Write a protein that binds this ligand. Structure first.
Ligand SMILES: [Ca+2]
Lengths: 223, 8
């Protein structure tokens, strides 16, 4: 997260870190055994780290739970990043508590200008890299489809939205992928991609979770 | 680029 702020430990209790011996993506806990992340975060060897704040220190409240299923959307296209959503089933249910909590899925899509909280342990620099220890947060609005499509012509599918700040300086960034964009208490986005981070006129692009709620539910229900 | 570590 570039231009964000330290969330505060466990203030984003649905935020998970996907760890493969290092944090590589975020995710969002959507029930005690399932995490939503980005399809492009798929890999083997995912350990979901819940309850994290400082991802480099065991502070307490962590739950590390291996992914037992990592379900990339069947129609994920790694070139276009359409359907950039993955469900991770935890090998065992997380113990939910105030610091490890699911986030609700949308019941409907969010509107342009809705303010959302985007969080993650991604790079905090728009140039170069600095990976934070603690979870960073960014309040960011959903942009209009027209602005999103203007920023990324031909690249924004119906399963994407832009959020953030065209003036630059505030965005999700590498390492935030897969993590949440929560708006009005609903997981409306998954950090997916963007041109750089926090670059002028290049807002973050996010998987539009509301398009996947049924798929999520159906996939969870069948797994 | 995707926002994973590493970006893709
Ligand atoms: Ca920790």
């Amino acid at each position: 997260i570039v231009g964000g702020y330290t969330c505060g430990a466990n203030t984003v209790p649905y935020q998970v870190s996907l760890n493969s011996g290092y944090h590589f993506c975020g995710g969002s806990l959507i029930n005690s055994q399932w995490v939503v992340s980005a399809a492009h975060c798929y890999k083997s060897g995912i350990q979901v780290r819940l309850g994290e704040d400082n991802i480099n220190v065991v502070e307490g409240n962590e739950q590390f739970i291996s992914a037992s299923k990592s379900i990339v959307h069947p129609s994920y296209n790694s070139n276009t990043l359409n359907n950039d959503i993955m469900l991770i089933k935890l090998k065992s249910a997380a113990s939910l508590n105030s610091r490890v909590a699911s986030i609700s899925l949308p019941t409907s899509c969010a509107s342009a200008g809705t303010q959302c909280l985007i969080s993650g342990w991604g790079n905090t620099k728009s140039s170069g890299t600095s990976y934070p220890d603690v979870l960073k947060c960014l309040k960011a609005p959903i942009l209009s489809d027209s602005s999103c499509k203007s920023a990324y012509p031909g690249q924004i599918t119906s399963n994407m939205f832009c959020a953030g700040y065209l003036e630059g300086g505030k965005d999700s960034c590498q390492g935030d992928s897969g993590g949440p964009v929560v708006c009005s208490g609903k997981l409306q986005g998954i950090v997916s991609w963007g041109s750089g981070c926090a670059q002028k006129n290049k807002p973050g692009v996010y998987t539009k979770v509301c398009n996947y709620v049924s798929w999520i539910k159906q996939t969870i229900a069948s797994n | 680029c995707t926002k994973s570590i590493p970006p893709c």
